Symmetry: D2
Subunit: 125 residues, 4 copies
């Protein structure tokens, strides 16, 4: 029943070679796994998030976000990334994001706790 | 079994007067509701996220994040915010975040799709 | 005498079709003009910034930034963008940035004052 | 002749204990020095930037930004910070910023090149 439930659900790849597998729920849920090609990461990590299940019908994209905390059975990078973005449908469907990666730090080092970047996900490559 | 499962779970308030109610799961889950005191928002919205359930024991904070998509039974703001941050425990416990708020836009307006800010959550006020 | 003084100075174009003309000084200065292909902007606007005039020699990029306040003789958009990034030299030289665009706002609307994005500049197109 | 030329020019202090000394020009220029209380920094560093010299008269703040590249005669941190923000005048005048700190990196590590934060400057402390 979600407008882009079908368009969003599946396997996505970003420009770093990371893989995001996601299921979109009718109501707005996102659940899945993430495997990063870079950084202090091995194998899959749990992800959860939310998307707008009833987007505007004027050619606008579909807002969404999700989170990964970088702990699984293999490693713990004491950090979490959140991606905020929009899904755009069609023959070259994309999810265009910006992300914030916060590490656990001492209060002294907190100023330097957060990295910022941008990932573009596609259904190919 | 999560290290800050107890410290995180509950009701938090930010500097805008918004209210975040969250349950932390032993494994890393965050689930809850968010009510914003500002913007195109009314009542509670679903939130989901992840936290590091086994943080460093050296006085570092606990990395976490979560997402709200701004649709509920009342309104649809065609947008989603993700908060990335760290929980710091103790008598003045805090969750210090930065956030990204993406709106669904046309490809023409996509450059201007994302707001960035910072929220500090406390257990009082 | 600046290491990338020569590589940086000139005309650059981003993915939106904007044009950045810059002179790099030996000491670290950047001065120039910016013309945005989008938004509340017409013609050229003054820019100033700074770059690292003695970068690492290990294949690392060259950190830099600059600012435009969106006032000139034609328009005043009551806003300023800052680009932070790195210059990478070679046959496909690039300046890879992230940017923050702050508008003047009332204290009530300050939460929503700042847009964030990413621009990639090239010497062609 | 700049509206907040007088309000902006002077010495400012942020929550980390850093010191920003700035002169505002009638036309929009900002020039000065910055001394960071944290990070890979010693003594003063050159800063340059721009502000809106004719802000809205409706109680809105005054948009501005500036850049520091972290090289001076003492150290070179192969990095640059840009602050984007707004000046708010009155008895408790403030400059409320967000900042992007980019390091020069290899193309492999570029994903992790940029830190993001927020500084609040005041005329006291």
């Amino acid at each position: 029943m979600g407008r882009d439930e079908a368009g969003i659900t599946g396997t996505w790849y970003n420009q770093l070679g990371s893989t995001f597998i996601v299921t979109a729920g009718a109501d707005g849920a996102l659940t899945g796994t993430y495997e990063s090609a870079v950084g202090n990461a091995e194998s899959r990590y749990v992800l959860t998030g939310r998307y707008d299940s009833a987007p505007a019908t004027d050619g606008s994209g579909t807002a969404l976000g999700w989170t990964v905390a970088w702990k699984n059975n293999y490693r713990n990078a004491h950090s979490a990334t959140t991606w905020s973005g929009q899904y755009v449908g069609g023959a070259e469907a994309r999810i265009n994001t910006q992300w914030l990666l916060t590490s656990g730090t001492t209060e002294a080092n907190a100023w330097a706790s957060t990295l910022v970047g941008h990932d573009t996900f596609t259904k190919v490559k």
